[PDB]
Structure 1
Amino acid sequence: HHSYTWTGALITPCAAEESKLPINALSNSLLRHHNMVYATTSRSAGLRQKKVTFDRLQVLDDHYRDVLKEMKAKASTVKAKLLSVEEACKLTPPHSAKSKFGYGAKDVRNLSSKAVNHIHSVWKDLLEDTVTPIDTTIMAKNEVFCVQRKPARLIVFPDLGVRVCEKMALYDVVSTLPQVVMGSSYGFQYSPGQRVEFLVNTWKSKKNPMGFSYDTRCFDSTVTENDIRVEESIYQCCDLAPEARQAIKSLTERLYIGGPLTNSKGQNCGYRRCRASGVLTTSCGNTLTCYLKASAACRAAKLQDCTMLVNGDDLVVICESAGVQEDAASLRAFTEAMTRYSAPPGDPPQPEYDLELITSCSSNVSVAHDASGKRVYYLTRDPTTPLARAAWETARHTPVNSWLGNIIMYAPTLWARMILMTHFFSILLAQEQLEKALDCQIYGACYSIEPLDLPQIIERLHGLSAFSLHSYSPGEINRVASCLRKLGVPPLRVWRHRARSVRARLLSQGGRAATCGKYLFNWAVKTKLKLTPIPAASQLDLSGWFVAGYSGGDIYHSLSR
């Protein structure tokens, strides 16, 4: 029952890897303490291998089976469709890993006969064989962090032809089933603003609210064969075409439950018997399993009037308090249940009685004020990681631009507005790349977005108030300022000065560039501007943006109007 077994072969890189922060002429304008930023590399994979390898034991009780029966009842109301081959390779990211069988993501997106012919053969094989383990590649991820150093996280994924097959059989299912099963508890159906609204309303609904986040140590590794088969039983509750049921059974037996691990050089590194981090079902499966085990644990701990919010392996619960001391006792019982269900904690959970002090999905609720002075709740987070990554992206082009995803998701924040928008629009202006579409990620899915569309995107997601927030909380201001001193980032006053320049430069360009200056940087001037609804914003097809999670799922979309 070990999560993994290893042969000793090394997890190898695909090309040259850098760990030290690359430095160019723009670096010091953003961050000076270069030695604090680093990128993980395959050199530390062995340490991660150690950490994710352990034995799992599961003791399933009546609460567990009761919750599951409830979930299946809701799953039975779902009707899902099979995706055509063309539909599935249109969801493939342009730079997804090429197939070992002579074609790449470009060929897939182009519907080339070679890729399409191979895909149909992979599909036919899934239908005719439900036993043979499917090969997977294991890689160390290159991710940037700030010190105080963690080893690289690993990604396990099947070949390209198989990935397109997963979409055909399960795309509709993983996009629809989660919300039907868990209702308001499914986190990925919300925009950051909608998430804040749900948390605040829930908090307010309790007479004496108490809340806690639960961090499961290496969630993927805690996922057992039982768990993966339970997930498939939920998927099979849906009204599905016969071929889809066959494909789902086959993919569960041959891929989801486990399989061999091959490095980039083609050597066998070992075997996996836990969740694969790079399959279409990683997000949905984790959310379902996290919801199941947590719901059952709440019952076991006798938690009163619980409301949960789940995003994959991330969980936050808000309930009725039973007194501070009693709540502490309740959490130990909750944790004991989770442990029995194979979901032990990394950091032990602690009860919070202030909503703003709860961090879930790396974020927390905070308050500011709009133009009218009205209090407004919004989503924020510690900016350390977003700034560390921005520093890297300042001197290196990366496959995914975290700064852009951060501006989109954290547009209302003090730090995203004053530092990220200021710094990157300055670089884009200098290279005249305002209209150059860049790749970013939202809830794990990849989107190609032109920076010029930001004002419209922001208005649609957060409302015009994102362009006028002020009087942030002392707690938030202090966290931002502390982080800047730690990283050696210039203080907010410097950013304000620079923004005025960026704004004027954008305005001088006229057109959409002007709108960017007008809306994104109104916070920079003494005499603020009007700021009315942008006409073209309504035409942006934003449906699909906040429907489901797809981390490790190999999903792409292009922004279209």
Structure 2
Amino acid sequence: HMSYTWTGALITPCAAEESKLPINALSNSLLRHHNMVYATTSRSAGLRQKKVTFDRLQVLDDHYRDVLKEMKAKASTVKAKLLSVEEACKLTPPHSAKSKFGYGAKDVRNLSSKAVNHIHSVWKDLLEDTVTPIDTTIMAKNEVFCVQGRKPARLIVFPDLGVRVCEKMALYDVVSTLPQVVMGSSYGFQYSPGQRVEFLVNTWKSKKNPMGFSYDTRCFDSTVTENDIRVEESIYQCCDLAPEARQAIKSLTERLYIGGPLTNSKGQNCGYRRCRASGVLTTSCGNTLTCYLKASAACRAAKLQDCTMLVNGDDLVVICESAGTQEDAASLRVFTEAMTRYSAPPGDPPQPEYDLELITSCSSNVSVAHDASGKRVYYLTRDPTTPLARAAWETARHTPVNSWLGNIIMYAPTLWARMILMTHFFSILLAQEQLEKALDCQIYGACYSIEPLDLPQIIERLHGLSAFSLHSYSPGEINRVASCLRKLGVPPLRVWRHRARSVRARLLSQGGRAATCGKYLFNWAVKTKLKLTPIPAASRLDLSGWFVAGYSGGDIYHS
């Protein structure tokens, strides 16, 4: 029962790959220690292949079937609809991988006859044939990291453009609607960061003696079995669906989700997958359900008292009622034993935490600062090393995903996003006159095209106005940022405050939406602080399509 089999054909690139941080005139204003930053390339793919290739054994007990029955009872209340071809096409990202059959993502977006005719033919074939495995492409992802020594490239596996549009037709409503019905408040992808921090704090405060822990599954996608994927299909099929949608979903499950052949960029056969594909629509929903199913069942096994789970795909955090520190630790071993029997064994062994701030989930921890009134406010933050490593790369190279922008949006209230990322990138945008130019970033796996001038209103909506007023950050948080800057050779925060005053004056000069950016984003930079009030255009923002579901690998775009 192996996750993959390989033919020995190489995982090959589709363009030149850089591994060394590209340096330009702007690089040194952010980061001096250039040799610390690197991009993964397909040269390391063989190391990743070894890591993701193993045997899966699963033993499923009454706890598992008990939780599953209940999940299915909730799934049976969901009514999901088929998307039209037009609706599915309009969710396709403009720069999505072109089809092997002679059209691209813009042909799809424009509903071009050739595109739409192909999509119709893939759909018909899905309904007519429920056995023939569907071809996928396996690619090495190029991602930027700081050394620690160097990690191998991650692998993405995805079907052709035509199939991706059919997935949407069949499953977009389901993967968007089902998970919150099944899991309720435990489905993480429904929350803004403000909502998520609130849920975490409220949940913590709701226990008499809280204990909390995160669970890291080693290579979760490879731990996912044919059983797991058929189980997911059986949850989908509990929904009230049109007969045509039922067939499409059974077919995609048999032919695509369960497994299939892997083809490299040069068209050669690299092997065969029998685990979760990283690049399908159901990757996030399937991972979330399957992780929640397994963990709920393991919580029962361990007899964890008054558990609340929070699950984003394969990222899992649990907060419960402590039974004492020794009992807690023992319960955790049992928990991990159960997860392992279910095929989800750990990377790091989990550990019990008695302080919310010491838990990492979605790569983030709770911390505390103060608003203008002096009131405590909790916010989500993280070690800034990877964010700043990538910011350094994106200073000198244009990338398909601007991580700096997703980091500003999602970590707006943080010391490091406000002082460094905002200051640095607005300074660049000013200089090139690109404040109004829409950029793409990825939030919960979906692709959004966002104008930098819109950030204040986006930030108010996700975080509230306090994001623009926070101060007296904790010593532990100040210290971690200061350490990171010393590690990467980033100028100290006193330097960034100086530049921010400049960037702010520059933005104020321009008036309009630029001055709003100066006024709200950089109020921290001046001693005589302005009074920040709700931004009118914020209540006007269409944050529909934001924070409904997760869509990692799912080829979803919002305009």
1:533 positional shift: 1.3
Residues 134 and 261 in structure 2, CA contact (< 8 A), matched pair in contact too: yes
> Quick one: distance in 2 between partners of 1:311 and 1:389?
23
SS at match of 1:315: strand
| Alpha-carbon displacement from aligned partner over 1:4-46 (angstroms, at most 9, x marks no partner) | 0000000000010000000000000000000000000000000
| 2:194–2:464 contact (8 Å) kept in structure 1 | no
Taking the aligned partners of 2:184 and 2:518, their CA distance within structure 1 comes to 40
**SS of equivalent residue, structure 1 residue 127:** helix
Is the 2:299–2:307 contact (alpha carbons within 8 Å) kept by the matching residues of 1?
Answer: yes
* Partner secondary structure for residue 423 of structure 1: helix
Aligned partners of 1:471 and 1:485: how far apart in 2? 21
Deviating more after overlay: 519-528 vs 453-462: 453-462
1:55-454 matches, within 5 Å, as: 55-148=55-148, 149-454=150-455
Q: How many residues align?
A: 557
Residue 323 of structure 1 deviates from its aligned partner by: 1.1
In the alignment, the residues of structure 2 paired with residue 206 and residue 467 of structure 1 have an alpha-carbon distance, to the nearest angstrom, of 31
Q: Distance in 1 between matches of 2:98 and 2:362?
A: 31
Give, in whole Å, the separation in 2 of the partners of 1:239 and 1:493: 58
- Superimposed CA distance per residue, residues 49-95 of structure 1 (whole angstroms, 9 cap, x where no aligned partner): 00000000000000000000000000000000000000000000000
Preserved contact between residue 10 and residue 264 of structure 2 (Cα < 8 Å): yes
Task: Give the Cα separation in 1 of the matches to 2:420 and 2:27.
Answer: 13
Could you tell me how far apart the structure 1 residues matched to 2:204 and 2:465 are?
A: 26
Please give the alpha-carbon distance, in whole angstroms, between the structure 2 residues aligned to 1:228 and 1:510. Answer: 54
Deviations 1:314-362 (A, max 9, x none): 0000011111111111111100000000000000000000000000010
**Distance in 2 (alpha carbons) for counterparts of 1:388 and 1:90:** 33
* RMSD, matched Cα: 0.5
Aligned to 2:238, what secondary structure does the other structure show?
coil
How far residue 537 of structure 1 moved from its aligned partner, in angstroms, is 1.6
More displaced, 12-21 or 325-334?
A: 325-334
Tell me what 2:25 maps to: 25
Contact map agreement 2:213 2:319 (CA 8 A) in 1 = yes
State the match for 1:11 in structure 2: 11
| TM-aligned CA deviation for residue 121 of structure 1 | 0.3
Deviation per CA, 1:406-436: give whole Å up to 9, x if none. Answer: 1000101100000000000000000000000
Measure how far apart 1:270 and its partner are: 0.2
Q: Deviations over 1:379-408 (max 9, x none)?
A: 111111100000000000000000011100
Residue 254 (structure 1) shift: 0.2
- 2 CA distance for matches of 1:533 and 1:58? 53
CA-to-aligned-CA distance 1:175-223 (integer Å, 9 cap, x gap): 0000000000000000011111111111111111100000000000000
CA distance in 1, matches of 2:496, 2:481: 13
Moved more, 504-513 or 91-100: 504-513
Task: Using the TM superposition, give the Cα deviation of residue 257 of structure 1 relative to its aligned residue in structure 2, in angstroms.
Answer: 0.2
- Separation of aligned partners in 2, 1:335 and 1:56: 16
Aligned partner of residue 90 in structure 2, secondary structure: coil
In 1, Cα distance between equivalents of 2:514 and 2:442 = 23
Structure 2: distance between partners of 1:470 and 1:94: 40
- CA deviation profile, 1:288-315 (whole Å, cap 9, x unmatched): 0000000000000111110000000000
Deviation at 1:123, TM superposition (A): 0.2
**Following the alignment from structure 1 to structure 2, what is the Cα–Cα distance between the partners of residues 464 and 190?**
17
Instruction: Return the offset for 1:530.
Output: 1.4
Residues 412 and 467, structure 2, Cα contact 8 Å, conserved in 1: yes
Aligned partner of residue 307 in structure 1, secondary structure: strand
* C-alpha separation in 2, matches of 1:537 and 1:219: 38
Measured in 1, the distance between the counterparts of 2:308 and 2:545 equals: 25
Instruction: Name the residue aligned to 1:474.
Output: 475
Q: Distance in 2 between matches of 1:205 and 1:464?
A: 26
CA distance in 1, matches of 2:460, 2:337: 45
- Following the alignment from structure 2 to structure 1, what is the Cα–Cα distance between the partners of residues 208 and 507? 50
Q: Distance in 1 between matches of 2:537 and 2:303?
A: 51
Shift of 1:477: 0.6
After TM superposition, the score normalised by the length of structure 2 is 0.99
Q: Secondary structure at the match of 1:373?
A: coil
In the TM superposition, residue 532 of structure 1 has moved relative to its aligned partner by: 1.3
Q: CA deviation at 1:534?
A: 1.3
Q: Structure 1 stretches of 5 or more lacking a match?
A: none
Distance of 2:293 and 2:259 partners within structure 1: 21
Deviations 1:127-164 (A, max 9, x none): 00000000000000000000000000000000000000
Q: Distance in 2 between matches of 1:84 and 1:449?
A: 26
> What is the deviation of 1:544?
1.9
Conserved 8 A contact 2:209-2:322: yes
Tell me, in whole angstroms, the C-alpha distance in 2 between the residues paired with 1:90 and 1:240. 22
Deviations 1:93-124 (A, max 9, x none): 00000000000001000100000000000000
| 1:236 counterpart SS class | helix
Cα distance in 2 for residues equivalent to 1:150 and 1:51: 11
Instruction: Describe the SS at the equivalent of 1:193.
Output: helix
Query: 1:469 offset after TM fit, Å?
Result: 0.4
Name whichever of 516-525 and 459-468 sits farther off: 459-468
C-alpha separation in 1, matches of 2:95 and 2:420 = 29
Secondary structure class of the residue paired with 2:379: strand
- Partner Cα distance (2:182, 2:513) in 1: 42
Deviations 1:248-281 (A, max 9, x none): 0000000000000000000000000000000000
TM norm structure 1: 0.99
Report the alpha carbon displacement of residue 510 of structure 1 after superposing the two structures with TM: 1.2
The equivalent residue for 1:507 is: 508
Is the 8 Å Cα contact of residues 157 and 278 (structure 2) preserved in structure 1? yes
The structural deviation recorded for 1:511 is 1.2
- Aligned equivalents of 1:351 and 1:10: distance in 2? 42
Question: Matched residue of 1:470: which SS?
Answer: coil
CA distance in structure 2 between the partners assigned to 1:220 and 1:72 by the alignment: 22
Q: Give 1:233 shift.
A: 0.1
The alpha carbon displacement at 1:503 in A equals: 0.4
Instruction: For residue 463 of structure 1, report the CA deviation from its aligned partner.
Output: 1.1
Inter-partner Cα distance in structure 1 for 2:541 and 2:376: 29
Cα separation, 1, equivalents of 2:54 and 2:459 = 44
Give me the whole-angstrom Cα distance separating, in 1, the residues matched to 2:513 and 2:335. Answer: 53
Structure 2: distance between partners of 1:536 and 1:415: 26
Shift, 1:454, TM fit:
0.6
Deviation at 1:545, TM superposition (A): 0.4
User: 1:536 Cα shift?
Assistant: 1.6
**How far off is 1:445 after superposition?**
0.3
**CA shift digits 1:485-506 (9 cap, x unpaired):** 0111001000000000000011
What is the Cα deviation at residue 232 of structure 1? 0.2
CA distance in 2: counterparts of 1:91 and 1:400, whole angstroms: 17
Q: CA deviation at 1:126?
A: 0.2
